Design a protein around this ligand. Structure first.
Ligand SMILES: Nc1ncnc2c1ncn2[C@@H]1O[C@H](COP(=O)(O)OP(=O)(O)OP(=O)(O)O)[C@@H](O)[C@H]1O
Ligand SMILES: Nc1ncnc2c1ncn2[C@@H]1O[C@H](COP(=O)(O)OP(=O)(O)OP(=O)(O)O)[C@@H](O)[C@H]1O
Ligand SMILES: Nc1ncnc2c1ncn2[C@@H]1O[C@H](COP(=O)(O)OP(=O)(O)OP(=O)(O)O)[C@@H](O)[C@H]1O
Ligand SMILES: Nc1ncnc2c1ncn2[C@@H]1O[C@H](COP(=O)(O)OP(=O)(O)OP(=O)(O)O)[C@@H](O)[C@H]1O
Ligand SMILES: Nc1ncnc2c1ncn2[C@@H]1O[C@H](COP(=O)(O)OP(=O)(O)OP(=O)(O)O)[C@@H](O)[C@H]1O
Ligand SMILES: Nc1ncnc2c1ncn2[C@@H]1O[C@H](COP(=O)(O)OP(=O)(O)OP(=O)(O)O)[C@@H](O)[C@H]1O
Ligand SMILES: [Mg+2]
Ligand SMILES: [Mg+2]
Ligand SMILES: [Mg+2]
Ligand SMILES: [Mg+2]
Ligand SMILES: [Mg+2]
Ligand SMILES: [Mg+2]
Lengths: 298, 295, 300, 300, 296, 280
């Protein structure tokens, strides 16, 4: 493989490998080919992720559905083994408008599911040489089969799994065909899940969409959903006991996404802490509803 | 790839071919045929038979009478060239209708050897490596006389006429298609193709797949059969279950869509039993299925 | 190829890395791969930029809002460490009509801030080789993580972060996806902030606009803003004490952007020194700028 | 490095020939090295020997030529004369606009000959490339090379197509090309004495952000009665005219709406029909031009 | 590029190149790029054209003006090298109503003149890849400069030189801009002449129209002009000695173009040879044969 | 190797030497070969003078160049236009022309020419004309040329304007075609451009059928059908039909037989009364 092979990269690959055999002692005496070692640099261990499922608000019906049909069937196959129809999905699509916690769910998936996480990107798959892109995808599925409870995550999956056409490069179409064959094809994988997140679900190819049968629509938050998101965002922050009305802010932030509320919480936090920060810089305060409505527009 | 696990796999795959047919003991393979041997699929790996594919009995019988039986006993199919096994069989249709399931059943429930290459095992950085791999692939097909060279996703496998295509795949275009023309002599080896976009396959390259097997979206009666095989090994109830209603309700559903519908309905039906065991499976009514569909 | 091994480029990369280690001694002993070394040619040190925050007029509320909400939370995290919502923005967009001072703010951000500045141009990112652009962006985010207080500035960001469509090329569709994943994905970045300037905010994709939560509108100058911009532009320039009236010019420059006032000052100063230039050109005292030369280049 | 463009034997010979002329004109460029992309821009270098047209060959436009000299040429090529004030700098871009045929290309050819600046008459064929990201690198090298040859002029004839108004329906590479051109033109890490002179007959098609990058605008409008006579006299220079019958003033009167190119064709027809008797004698084996020769083509 | 890389094209490109060497031996030492080689497929040698200037009727004043103002200044610079204004035009527009012989004049220009004729079409210019059409146009002008006595002919030029708009395609807009820059720009073309035939002159851009200063109006034939067109078309035909009245047919064809008269002769020839056609499957012309198909 | 090309080589052995490119191969898919259609010149009713004129002015000058080599003005026309009210059988004429005339029919529509990329439509048209030049006796039929050869203006799209100009250039330009002939079957002759109407100088007016023409059409369409001797009168049906196209009589003859059939199906016949029961 004429990719990676850097001093930082090879140190990263060994560092993740010593982590993986530490989480699972059965991963010892498992030989990985050279292409599979380059995939190991994309392994995300739970200590890297600082996001807990409790840090995602307003998605508890979706989180419970994520645990009931995706996490527990994969990570606990001993209790779903009474019938062959209680298996994990071949793929999961965390689609929806931008702002809603699709990557929050994937980060919590990387931390609390317990499965090995491969947060692979296009830079680790695309290679300038002829057959290296295909052998990377072959190794990515092969390594995920060796680490049997694995989740392969491709953020912004609408670009990797875009609709096939005559515009497609010779490598990309062959790359997509190789991904299709290993995903749901001959010589089926073990407990390997391809979890994806995207803003444009319709940009994904129909043959790739059929390989993501469990689709989670993380839509824009409602009035109650925004209140739960604002509560988790404003946790570990001193709010006013009487001069704070979180319900009013939730109703006024109609159409606000999760990231929009975070910036609103951020902008209101520096607005509230303007006096304290200026005093500290020259050398806090309970957050009120007037601070949020100052940056708001009703 | 002569890389430890690859070497172990090729030796193990060759060992499996020995017990499958002891006539191959005297046959010797070189290095490039050995690197193709890692793609050999044996029926022990596949767990999908022809009885696992519902809603496809006319196509399965047509598959047997055109590609399977003419290969296994060509003596009785040599009366006419039409009854002989074609050198190219294409399984095409909308995705999720069982093209791969037919390939899984072809690998398992057939006495022929089953080469299952991917495009990763063929393309290589070094010049001439891809041509020698393809040449050894057809040579290995001649050595294993009842062989099937299965190519999933034919659309990207050397089936494209574009100026952006490289010269390495341009000579791979000719090398594969010249050896394909030589496959019509013996007739005991075919190339089986699976695809969901027949428009991407080149018309000048499609003629070398004369046998076409259209696996369309399931009909009302076909979805009834597919729902039946998907729900086997799962215990049901006999009074409050009407699987006929689900078959008509799932309009436009593919086989993969029904498998997800069956899987999701089974999880919701077993939710109470899973909750007990996490910290007997409840009967599967038609209410769980009809909750998932739009009607 | 990596399109970074040019003789001038390699000397530029070594020179920029020497300045980065000189500014931040902790940047030594770190390891830079081949792709990350090419991004070093896009590093902008404060000695390159000659433009200060004091050289931007009319945007004092915006400059103050830039300091308290963007610069100070990023470069002084210990002041902002008491609350977890006091962090620097993951993205900053300086949008508005052209010629109003978005690059002026970006120049002062490069100079008057301790953050390492990566003013990456798009010729460095896109490459003819397959998958080279994705690794370059991955290296650009990787390098910005090594230089922990960092600013990745992309001028005219509406072309990079354009609204995604099926007509987009595969290399850019993966390039935008790679940029999106590293901007806000699983591997959360450190003090990396991506700052953008554009005239077409609506051309930016919705998923990319959400990655630029802090947005500064550098709109067309008002009557008071035009006077402040004219005063800054006419600094180090002799103006007449009685005949010159900056208030009349500022009110008469309705709809004038900051760049339009610079050209108006450029024409007015050229005609003011035309007699002096003709005397100097024949051989090879600047006349003070009055209101008449500014108004004769202007429309009432 | 190195695009498919500027790789032929003819092109490589042109780049080498253009570089020797540049080194001969400016001896300081001998030590200057260039990247493979900057070499391809060298084929677009226009030396004064390639242009046979001077400012004295442009009839009319004398206030425009003087304004071109005092505000564009002299502040650029004589920075020491204009170094007294910082506002006496040369403009970042020049736009010669107006109806076609009035002499915008005449001014650029005269600018290419007797301004003293290195001239890069780039075209869209030299900029656009079929490979991904090469057009951005070509534009980047175009600004890079123009910075090496410090008093440079990058001339883009018909600039309304290169700098067209940006839209969501614009091409992926073209919108990327315009953003890259915008960043290098007026962005951080500003250029030196690089000038971007543009000539077009559709000013309103130019983008607003590109039009603000062309602050010095010259309107080469349709010639007036006195301007038509000055163009007519220059066109009829080195041509025999009748001492009594010819009346140049009268012909200029009944050429209302005639551009400079229309007068050239009128002169071409009048000179050809006056010499037809001489042409017949020469072909088988010129009287002075009169007023009736011009009026037989003119409409009264 | 890739358009001029197919074996049929390269065979034509090679064949067209040698025909220039026999016609002009000085072109043997001139080398060409890949883009320049593609344009060579549009080179029209005089052997391809079977129409001379003698085959054009009713346009003798225009042909004489065509020779005096277009052909001779371009092909005899030494004859005209006494005044700077005695030069070939930068462009020639053969505009008028259809059928009057604008393309026939270009055919005679291709045959009865030694100028290399690049009869480029819009399909040879436009390419699906980015910037290839601009490089093709650059090669088209550069090859014509390497073939110094040259004529670049674009038939139906109103589409190529259409009025520029903000709604124009980006590649088309840059194609027109690249064409205008090379047609009249900093780099002066050497004896390169662009001739165009069109019906919608007003659809041509004003900046493109100034690059076609010499304009020939090939209008509908008059009563006198219809006589020569009829006579030239009816050549190599027995006609009649006393039963033929060409003046009567010419006067009865008001509003008839050359194409209309050509098919009028074609229908009359079929009716006159109607008896001989039946005999051959198993005659002198008459005025009644022409008046039968005519509508008076 | 394509199915159309082997049949073309089998009919004309000289086509084996001729090499084709990709766009010509794309044009090859629209080649109309006489075996897959069954429309016959003798199945055309009421147009026998038009049949004779079409034959003698189109087929024999184009298919028999040895016969017409005596005079330079006996050549085939550049184009042929079949225009008139709809339903009179212009498509019938084109299909029968494809059958009996052995010229390699190229029946393209306004769908194969259009491509989503820049320049591929003009290249497709150029390859269509080049393939027509290669298959020297040929007819390029374009149904509904009012869509293709619409009158030019300043408001047309750039792709369509370039397509029309490039088609005009190949139709009659410097490079003269061989025995290449183009047929358009339109309903509106005024919608065609003046220059495009010029390139179709052989106009054939397929007008509304007259009484004699209506009688011939009714006689032809009633083939393989049982008609009464004295109870059935085709002259009365022909006279009663006023302003009726050939397709209307196809609808009439099918339905009039059906009305006689349904009373015959009820038993398990066709008279002038049965024809005029629905005919008003
Ligand atoms: N439901 C939520 N609850 C709490 N915080 C949230 C929620 N949704 C978003 N956020 C906050 O906003 C940020 C936005 O990132 P997020 O994971 O939502 O991206 P996304 O919308 O999935 O991304 P993409 O733009 O690729 O679609 C999160 O990191 C988190 O801080
Ligand atoms: N006819 C069928 N009978 C039973 N199950 C089926 C059938 N078709 C599909 N399925 C179910 O759906 C799954 C997906 O089918 P499969 O992979 O064979 O589809 P495909 O048509 O080959 O897809 P693709 O074109 O996307 O590669 C199967 O593994 C099986 O569970
Ligand atoms: N507020 C201002 N104060 C002083 N000078 C200004 C101001 N705004 C603009 N200028 C002048 O105009 C130029 C700044 O243009 P700049 O590149 O920042 O524009 P922009 O608004 O970012 O637009 P664009 O995106 O088109 O580049 C400088 O030369 C500067 O002298
Ligand atoms: N002012 C002028 N004085 C003298 N000659 C002129 C003048 N304007 C035009 N001409 C003559 O007409 C020709 C056409 O002028 P030129 O090419 O400069 O036009 P332009 O205004 O740049 O138009 P376009 O927009 O078509 O490029 C010149 O080459 C020159 O011979
Ligand atoms: N002056 C003429 N003498 C003889 N025949 C003529 C003359 N003008 C036209 N014709 C006949 O009519 C035809 C006109 O075709 P031509 O291509 O020359 O027309 P055009 O005027 O250029 O129009 P278009 O724009 O429609 O192509 C000629 O091919 C020829 O048969
Ligand atoms: N003259 C005719 N003789 C016999 N049958 C005819 C005649 N005209 C029409 N028909 C019948 O009616 C059908 C419709 O006619 P056809 O489509 O050929 O007419 P058209 O004028 O070309 O139509 P359109 O303008 O609508 O395309 C024919 O297929 C045929 O069955
Ligand atoms: Mg995300
Ligand atoms: Mg499959
Ligand atoms: Mg700017
Ligand atoms: Mg010009
Ligand atoms: Mg013509
Ligand atoms: Mg029809």
């Amino acid at each position: 493989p004429l990719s990676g092979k850097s001093r930082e990269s090879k140190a990263k690959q060994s560092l993740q490998w010593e982590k993986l055999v530490k989480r699972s002692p059965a991963l010892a005496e498992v030989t990985l080919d050279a292409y599979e070692r380059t995939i190991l640099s994309s392994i995300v261990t739970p200590d890297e992720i600082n996001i807990t499922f409790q840090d995602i608000g307003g998605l508890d019906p979706l989180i419970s559905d994520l645990h009931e049909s995706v996490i527990y069937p994969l990570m606990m196959p001993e209790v779903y083994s009474n019938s062959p129809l209680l298996q994990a999905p071949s793929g999961v699509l965390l689609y929806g408008p931008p702002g809603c916690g699709k990557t929050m769910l994937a980060k919590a998936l990387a931390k609390e599911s317990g499965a090995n996480f491969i947060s692979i990107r296009m830079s680790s798959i695309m290679d300038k040489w002829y057959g290296e892109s295909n052998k990377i995808v072959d190794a990515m599925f092969s390594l995920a089969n060796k680490l049997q409870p694995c989740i392969i995550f491709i953020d912004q999956i609408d670009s990797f799994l875009r609709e096939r056409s005559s515009t497609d490069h010779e490598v990309t179409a062959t790359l997509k065909a190789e991904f299709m064959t290993l995903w749901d094809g001959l010589l089926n994988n073990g407990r390997v899940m391809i979890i994806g997140a995207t803003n444009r679900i319709n940009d994904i190819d129909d043959a790739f969409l059929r390989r993501l049968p469990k689709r989670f629509l993380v839509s824009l938050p409602g009035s109650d959903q925004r209140y739960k998101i604002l509560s988790v965002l404003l946790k570990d922050t001193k709010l006013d006991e009487d001069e704070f009305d979180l319900q009013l802010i939730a109703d006024n932030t109609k159409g606000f996404s999760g990231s929009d509320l975070k910036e609103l919480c951020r902008e209101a936090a520096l607005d509230a802490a303007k006096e304290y920060i200026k005093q500290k810089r020259q050398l806090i305060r309970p957050l009120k509803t007037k601070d949020f409505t100052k940056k708001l527009r009703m």
